[PDB]
């Protein structure tokens, strides 16, 4: 997260850390959606142009954390994965279309002050909130500049951007399965996600019912926080039926 700040404690209790068992390293963000399911970006697990293909036993997830590296005793939860599900239409070659994955945990997790699921959006919420100019919020332990990593969880708020602007900003083919967010160069304020923040949630607070909803997954970018350049996020409401099916089919 570039140009953000430290998170308050419990500020993002659905934030999840995707960890590799060996070497013990942080791969990505992710998010807690049920007591058995975590949602990340597919490229965190599978990215064939670099021969990345992580098994269920390659990884852990860590929930409830704030410190990046330190074991947060009686606060965090470490869970082993039962099964990984990647979207069948995930396009690793061209544009990271449908950059989304679900990981089933070996056992259900107990919620707490620090560990708590975020909501996925319904149609009405989504229609209402996915509008250019509205700000949402991105969190992660990814990098602070583009050329190092944060002591604790970083948060930043950024506005959703009109699709024609997003389309003109990048060379890459963009699908309606992805949206972009960020400030424009003449808006003054700055901020972005960066490497390591993939799978982390782009979220919005519903003025209608006070709940936080996950509208996006941190997917990709070109640099981090470059003028004219915007962070790209997996459009979560577009892929919600896949999420539903998988859960209901394999829970």
């Amino acid at each position: 997260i570039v140009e953000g700040s430290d998170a308050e404690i419990g500020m993002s209790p659905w934030q999840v850390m995707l960890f590799r068992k060996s070497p013990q390293e942080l791969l990505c963000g992710a998010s807690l959606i049920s007591d058995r399911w975590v949602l990340t970006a597919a490229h965190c697990l599978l990215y064939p142009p670099w021969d990345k293909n992580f098994t269920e036993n390659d990884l852990l997830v860590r929930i409830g954390k704030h410190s990046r590296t330190r074991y947060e005793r009686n606060i965090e939860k470490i869970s082993m994965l039962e099964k990984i599900y990647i979207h069948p239409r995930y396009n690793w070659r061209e544009n990271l279309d449908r950059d989304i994955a679900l990981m089933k945990l070996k056992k259900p997790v107990a919620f707490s002050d620090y560990i708590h699921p975020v909501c996925l959006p319904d149609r009405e919420t989504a229609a209402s909130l996915l509008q250019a100019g509205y700000k949402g919020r991105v969190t992660g332990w990814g990098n602070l500049k583009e050329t190092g990593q944060p002591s604790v969880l970083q948060v930043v708020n950024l506005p959703i951007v009109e699709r024609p602007v997003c389309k003109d900003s990048t060379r890459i083919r963009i699908t309606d399965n992805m949206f972009c967010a960020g400030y424009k160069p003449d808006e003054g304020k700055r901020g972005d996600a960066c490497e390591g923040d993939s799978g982390g949630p782009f979220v919005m607070k519903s003025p209608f019912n006070n709940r936080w909803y996950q509208m996006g997954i941190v997917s990709w970018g070109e640099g981090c926080d470059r003028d004219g350049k915007y962070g790209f996020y997996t459009h979560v409401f577009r892929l919600k039926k896949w999420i539903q099916k998988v859960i209901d089919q394999f829970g």
């Binding site: 308050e8 919005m204 003025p207 006070n210």
Partner: peptide
């Protein structure tokens, strides 16, 4: 079920330091 309502924020009616920024954006 319970989703979206943070124990240390919404369940106490306590706001985080930057959430208004979002709400003013609507």
């Amino acid at each position: 079920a319970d989703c979206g309502l943070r124990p240390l924020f919404e369940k106490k009616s306590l706001e985080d330091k930057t959430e208004r920024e979002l709400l003013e954006s609507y």
